Design an enzyme around this catalytic site. Structure first.
Site, PDB file in Angstrom:
ATOM      1  N   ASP B  50       0.921  -1.231  -0.007  1.00 56.50           N
ATOM      2  CA  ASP B  50       0.026   0.007   0.050  1.00 56.50           C
ATOM      3  C   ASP B  50       0.869   1.148  -0.039  1.00 56.50           C
ATOM      4  O   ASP B  50       2.002   1.318   0.196  1.00 56.50           O
ATOM      5  CB  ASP B  50      -1.001  -0.155   1.263  1.00 56.50           C
ATOM      6  CG  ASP B  50      -0.290  -0.280   2.634  1.00 56.50           C
ATOM      7  OD1 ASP B  50       0.512  -1.129   2.658  1.00 56.50           O
ATOM      8  OD2 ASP B  50      -0.386   0.607   3.468  1.00 56.50           O
ATOM      9  N   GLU B  52       1.908   5.006   1.461  1.00 58.25           N
ATOM     10  CA  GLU B  52       1.546   5.932   2.893  1.00 58.25           C
ATOM     11  C   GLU B  52       2.254   7.190   2.457  1.00 58.25           C
ATOM     12  O   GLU B  52       3.321   7.414   1.954  1.00 58.25           O
ATOM     13  CB  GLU B  52       2.095   5.259   3.949  1.00 58.25           C
ATOM     14  CG  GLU B  52       1.769   3.821   4.199  1.00 58.25           C
ATOM     15  CD  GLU B  52       2.506   3.316   5.385  1.00 58.25           C
ATOM     16  OE1 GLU B  52       2.149   3.212   6.492  1.00 58.25           O
ATOM     17  OE2 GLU B  52       3.287   2.567   4.847  1.00 58.25           O
ATOM     18  N   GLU B 145       0.570  -8.312  32.156  1.00 61.57           N
ATOM     19  CA  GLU B 145      -0.714  -8.579  31.903  1.00 61.57           C
ATOM     20  C   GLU B 145      -0.881  -9.834  31.125  1.00 61.57           C
ATOM     21  O   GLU B 145      -1.869 -10.587  31.468  1.00 61.57           O
ATOM     22  CB  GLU B 145      -1.718  -7.304  31.022  1.00 61.57           C
ATOM     23  CG  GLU B 145      -2.920  -7.517  30.968  1.00 61.57           C
ATOM     24  CD  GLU B 145      -3.835  -6.163  30.287  1.00 61.57           C
ATOM     25  OE1 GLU B 145      -4.280  -6.312  29.377  1.00 61.57           O
ATOM     26  OE2 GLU B 145      -3.409  -5.299  31.107  1.00 61.57           O
ATOM     27  N   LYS B 149      -2.722 -13.793  31.767  1.00 62.82           N
ATOM     28  CA  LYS B 149      -3.536 -14.268  30.847  1.00 62.82           C
ATOM     29  C   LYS B 149      -3.079 -15.901  30.496  1.00 62.82           C
ATOM     30  O   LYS B 149      -3.897 -16.842  30.468  1.00 62.82           O
ATOM     31  CB  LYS B 149      -3.553 -13.643  29.668  1.00 62.82           C
ATOM     32  CG  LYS B 149      -4.475 -12.386  29.660  1.00 62.82           C
ATOM     33  CD  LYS B 149      -4.385 -11.402  28.504  1.00 62.82           C
ATOM     34  CE  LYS B 149      -5.354 -10.390  28.509  1.00 62.82           C
ATOM     35  NZ  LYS B 149      -5.164  -9.282  27.347  1.00 62.82           N
TER      36      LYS B 149
END
Ligand SMILES: [Ca+2]
Ligand SMILES: [Ca+2]
Ligand SMILES: [Ca+2]
Lengths: 252, 253
Positions: B50, B52, B145, B149
């Site tokens: 793509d 940018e 975190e 998990k």
């Protein structure tokens, strides 16, 4: 030692200690304090972290405290009522992942029904915002991912394909979550809940099976499954009217 | 739309200049500079990449973007005032290694006064304290975190989340390494390959990335062992480099 196991009673003790600290420190500037996430839903697991939200009266208040004790982790967000209500009514690509916060609030302090207002704002978002979010996700994420795996097919690196396939499965889960207007319970349940929804894009369930089983080493099969899912996306958006504008070469 | 089509750099640059002329036509002398970044900016664009582009505006508080597809290709153009862009270029978030390579890959297309060079100089001059702070935050906000998990997975499932979680941990480890070494990854595809070639990695990270890069993520017990070993390596590495805050108090405010 990493996070330890705690009970829901121990976590609620910690939450109420933090509530008293917030009221002590910020005083009359506190409008409301809530618990959200798994603890807010009373479905916290042995190792879950603690997430709390505060509504402040101060204009432009937007900060957070996020810390560990070595044994558990807490995040407390502080927002003005206006900032929180605006955020609750914005539908981004990752809305199904972020806005479950507002459907899991356990009020612990509230001076004027503020957390109920936040919930009502979050649930009353108009259908057009999900339509816009879906069209944006197709352009900003899925179309971009398709270019990435098509580049891999012709020039590598295949070592990125397992990570990219995980990202594509998550993006598809956002697409399904936006279409059905559902917020996933936990990050762990995103894919399992997504593939149980009705009206899946063709090929999405098959793609998620590689991701959920961890069988991501057959690069050719993954590339075929990604192309099949991308085709399923096109038919699915046509079926549901999520039409992306492709008519303008430069749209400004 | 058949999805992204094969294009040459010549074809992509033709599109870039069409967009440049439209930007100059519409905003005129409010445009201070226009650049291409990403793979096209680096002259390493692949067949399907793509486009940018970035635009520096003179307009006070200008901050908008246009992102669209023609069905065959996709473009994103960001428009920022100079102050907004320079502030963004000097802000170090957890994903700085993934976002700010932009400022080290600018291909200048239009520049009325050294603006793009100023952006580059700002991005490369960020104070060390901002990387120290970002690393300490990443440890708390992501790695700690994630540890909760996967430990929840160990005791209550679902193991169907473990491959995705292991991928996310490897990426967060790459952010930690990128912040520590002040390096921005070239592409999303090269993040892990570039991360594991850096020196002084936390112990266990190479083995973790071996699962993720090979795609062999079906042995849950092996993944859990590898994740715990990396988590142990994190403790040793952050302590040796001083990426440590006082955690003795239950509420640190
Ligand atoms: Ca992009
Ligand atoms: Ca922007
Ligand atoms: Ca979090």
């Amino acid at each position: 030692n990493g996070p330890i196991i705690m009970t829901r009673e121990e976590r609620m003790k910690i939450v109420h200690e933090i509530k008293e600290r917030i009221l002590d420190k910020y005083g009359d500037d506190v409008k409301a304090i809530g618990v959200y996430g798994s603890l807010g839903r009373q479905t916290d697991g042995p190792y879950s972290d603690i997430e709390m939200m505060c509504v402040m009266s101060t204009e432009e208040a937007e900060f957070s405290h996020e810390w560990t004790t070595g044994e558990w982790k807490v995040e407390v967000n502080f927002d003005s009522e206006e900032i929180l209500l605006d955020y609750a009514s914005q539908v981004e690509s990752d809305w199904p992942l972020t806005h479950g916060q507002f459907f899991s609030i356990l009020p612990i302090y509230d001076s004027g029904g503020y957390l109920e207002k936040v919930y009502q704002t979050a649930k009353s978002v108009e259908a057009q915002k999900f339509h816009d979010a879906i069209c944006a996700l197709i352009v900003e994420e899925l179309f971009e991912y398709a270019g990435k795996w098509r580049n891999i097919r012709v020039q590598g690196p295949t070592t990125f394909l397992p990570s990219l396939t995980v990202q594509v499965a998550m993006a598809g889960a956002m697409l399904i979550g936006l279409h059905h207007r559902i917020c996933y319970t936990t990050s762990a349940s995103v894919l399992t809940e997504a593939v149980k929804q009705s009206d899946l894009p063709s090929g999405y369930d098959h793609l998620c099976q590689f991701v959920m089983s961890g069988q991501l080493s057959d690069s050719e099969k993954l590339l075929e499954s990604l192309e099949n899912f991308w085709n399923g996306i096109q038919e699915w958006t046509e079926r549901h009217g999520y039409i992306v504008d492709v008519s303008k070469r430069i749209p400004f």
